[PDB]
Amino acid sequence: TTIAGVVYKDGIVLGADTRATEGMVVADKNCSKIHFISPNIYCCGAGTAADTDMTTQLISSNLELHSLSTGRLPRVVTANRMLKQMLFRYQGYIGAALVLGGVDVTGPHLYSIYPHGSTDKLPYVTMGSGSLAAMAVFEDKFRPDMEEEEAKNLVSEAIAAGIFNDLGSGSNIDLCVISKNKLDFLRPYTVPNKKGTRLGRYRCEKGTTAVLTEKITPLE
Template identity: 40%
Template sequence: MEESPELLNKSVGGLAEFDFSLCERNHALKRQMDGEGFGKLFENMTKMTSSGTTIVGAIFQDGVVLGGDSRSTQGNIIANKKAMKVHYLTDRIYASGAGGSADLEKVSQIVSAELRLFELNSGLQARVVMAVRRLRQYLFKYMGHVSCYYLVGGVDPTGSHLFTVKASGNALRKAVEAEGSGSYCAVAELENGFKPNMTEGECVALIKKGIEAGMRGDNMSGNSYNIMVITAKGLKKELGIKPSFAKEEKIENQFKFNAESLTVLSKRVQAAL
């Protein structure tokens, strides 16, 4: 069965409400590729990807606390057990990131460099809204194709701020928030325990509960987690925190080779320059 060109080339309509025009086109493409033997390829192309992350943030009376787990995944494989998901922007502004590791690292570096140049040229401290604005401008150009979801938090002369920035370029001001595949579990703890004007200790305890809930409920989040406490006085770090339910990893099959098992064929000694 050959699909009509009008259906295959269908564009998004100009409706004010949600538009599902492309659903018919996608079904037609699937039918055509099935007939040509490429149906499996189409399924892989349109498959949703999990960000495999739990990142959280909350405001307290003197600053902001950001945190994230340390598991970086590549499909069903744990690629990195000690990934740092809280990215540096300035000395008083950090961003927890969910999405693609390479995208998050590079976009964070670009915005961090721009903020630093502003501080050097003006002699002023960069504002949190400036970081959010630059992230929004950069990400909006790519319409979601750059896989970056941020929780931007920091302290500046106007106070303590926390924003969520989506890959589409949308941003919202928040008092407490979670992102990533483990956010469904984390946000339940955060919303249940959050209250205005928390102390630093209360906020850190809440962030820990949120991250651990995400790690417990999402197998793409795990291993350990890191927390950054940002205040006007500076930065406090808690790194490599392991929850009580995490199993101790033991390295098995450590082989020790006998030094005499290898035969030395020749030796040469050369003086260092």
């Protein structure tokens, strides 16, 4: 698991890989790790996969309730305050590492939330198991006020560093670009690893399997 985010001159670029490993066996090859919160705020998740799902849906339900009452656009500091007040209440038993980012009225804002409830605003963050390989790309090649073509090229390079160097990572790279007026969510940004093609024909025909009892029930 490798998630990362950055703040360029206009907005925020988020990125993640697509793999879920149960034990040491690859369970899912296309697990979507970037979630919806509001039409301007997304979040990336790491840690326990069921804990991040049920938490990112509860807060997204509450901001839909909150923004529809106030009649205006949500703010990123509100979603920060809802998360770190409920994670502290569950005393860290809910393992959910989150990268939060959005563009409200005040501008772009990027947060990183730890499963005990500690947060911090930063210009670039990495979480996950392969976070250390991705931080080395950000630490070497960051510059403030980049354009989004440099920002998309920087993040996709940093996610790819966690692909080829961490065992619990590595498939297609997702990205999302959030700006003041544009939301570009796109999952297959690049395909660095394919599957090799089969050589031998293993194909069996009908009648190579013994059947003891068959039943047919029609429907309509």
